Write a protein that binds this ligand. Sequence first.
Ligand code: ANP
Ligand code: ANP
Ligand code: EXL
Ligand code: EXL
Ligand code: MG
Ligand code: MG
Ligand code: MG
Ligand code: MG
Lengths: 261, 261
Amino acid sequence: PALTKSQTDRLEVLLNPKDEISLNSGKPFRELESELLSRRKKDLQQIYAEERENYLGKLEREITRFFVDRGFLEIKSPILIPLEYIERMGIDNDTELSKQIFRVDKNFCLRPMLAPNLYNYLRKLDRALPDPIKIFEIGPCYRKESDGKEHLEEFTMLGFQQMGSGCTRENLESIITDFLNHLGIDFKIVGGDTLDVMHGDLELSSAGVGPIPLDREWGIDKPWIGAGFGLERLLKVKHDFKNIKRAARSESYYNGISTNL
Amino acid sequence: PALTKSQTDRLEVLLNPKDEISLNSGKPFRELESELLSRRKKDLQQIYAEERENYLGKLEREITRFFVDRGFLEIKSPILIPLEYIERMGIDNDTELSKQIFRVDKNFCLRPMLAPNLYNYLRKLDRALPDPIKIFEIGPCYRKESDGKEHLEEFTMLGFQQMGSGCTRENLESIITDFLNHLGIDFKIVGGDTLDVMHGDLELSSAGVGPIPLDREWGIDKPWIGAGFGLERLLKVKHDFKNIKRAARSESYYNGISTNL
Ligand SMILES: Nc1ncnc2c1ncn2[C@@H]1O[C@H](COP(=O)(O)OP(=O)(O)NP(=O)(O)O)[C@@H](O)[C@H]1O
Ligand SMILES: Nc1ncnc2c1ncn2[C@@H]1O[C@H](COP(=O)(O)OP(=O)(O)NP(=O)(O)O)[C@@H](O)[C@H]1O
Ligand SMILES: Cn1cc(C[C@H](N)C(=O)O)c2ccccc21
Ligand SMILES: Cn1cc(C[C@H](N)C(=O)O)c2ccccc21
Ligand SMILES: [Mg+2]
Ligand SMILES: [Mg+2]
Ligand SMILES: [Mg+2]
Ligand SMILES: [Mg+2]
């Protein structure tokens, strides 16, 4: 009696990437399910007995320490932002992002990105802080997305930006490289300069070197370097999850372990 | 020449609670403004040179360590939640909260509270973890509010909950008391049991002891204790801010310092 596709789907919910269990073994579904249920209950018991930390929270804290220690100021800015910030980012029809916005009320949206708020902080802090100005933010961002194993509608972005002196492509690649070697994540950098940070075919980050013409709409007139990274994609690679759902804010998975036991 | 109300409003933006400057001094507005601008620029320079941490992020990390160390599992659950969770919480017309919901699309809303997701986690984790089950979450919550010095529309909630053995009012008051003495925040506890944690006339928390009849709609049939705290209200008290805007996710204040310099 071979397993049904529905049964294999159920077992795949319970399977963790380092389990060495093969589904075709010939063992009955009920037995395979009971084995995986026992393993996942034990995984949750071990977390509860020892560390008790959530992967997404813990990763945020680790990234925060890395950037604070490298001289970047920690920002916490609004998640619910004025809708006019989207248009002011140059996002209109004929851009993909235009159709992906979660609107709230008449004049607000859930931010799909961190760039508007980081631009505003760079402009304001230039009146107080010495050159160069280095800032970062980690927090929720929102985009409407087609179903896909690499995309969430509710995700978490790291964004960092430096403005003034030292804003070279070399220095940008150095930050990225030190950061991902610190986290233990393999990558390739692929390249007004623009560049993407790839893990195989998966985009971990897009990064940039300024100035660009958009800066003037935000009151920025200095060179800059910066990048944006999705935390759930970093977790997906680090823990070898097959679907990014395992890494997201979720009621269905805790540290990549099914909560439906 | 006395200061105008508009001028005093501008100086109050620049005034920090421990400044020992009196507005009626007789000094001209321009001079008082220049003094406060210099002080606030220096405050930002000192943060940037030394700690570089945001108060709201740092408070979240401190609270996280307190609860993890006391045996509570750290949860990160969705901020964008099904609208049906609101009705299932018993929130209908004739309740205040009913009119305060930020709706998104047809079937979702920004969570105004943490209770639905914590109920769901308690039910699911009861199948895996030993008694008692202790969990907590910190993160963004959203409510439409009238203008007021104690309310934000975008705020941050701590919610903790224990289920099973040990769920007594005494144990609940002990958690609260240890927590606020750890943070250095003065309070009074004022009291199916219900109780509020007050700082003067300001509500820091509402807390509760179960079971209650609502539990059955969430699949819960064990005793419980729990509470919810606003982080920005804790910061407002700790730092003696006159308006909670100083403590919120914001583009206008950084660690209670005006960014408009
Ligand atoms: N829906 C999403 N879910 C998870 N992470 C995301 C999502 N959208 C963007 N990210 C992350 O945020 C980073 C910066 O955003 P951005 O450069 O705008 O993404 P993007 O170009 O739309 N990438 P993609 O949709 O994969 O082609 C990306 O490199 C991802 O790591
Ligand atoms: N709009 C808000 N801004 C900031 N903190 C809030 C807000 N609403 C609730 N809180 C915090 O969240 C805690 C738990 O929420 P809840 O008990 O529902 O609040 P509440 O009853 O509406 N309090 P209040 O509106 O002041 O009378 C409160 O005790 C506050 O510390
Ligand atoms: C600061 N920052 C953030 C991003 C990612 C995305 N565009 C966002 O705004 O969140 C980014 C990309 C290139 C250069 C700088 C960047
Ligand atoms: C777990 N928890 C959370 C709250 C506050 C608010 N009602 C919310 O849901 O976020 C709360 C109040 C009493 C008892 C337990 C509580
Ligand atoms: Mg995209
Ligand atoms: Mg990209
Ligand atoms: Mg209220
Ligand atoms: Mg209350």
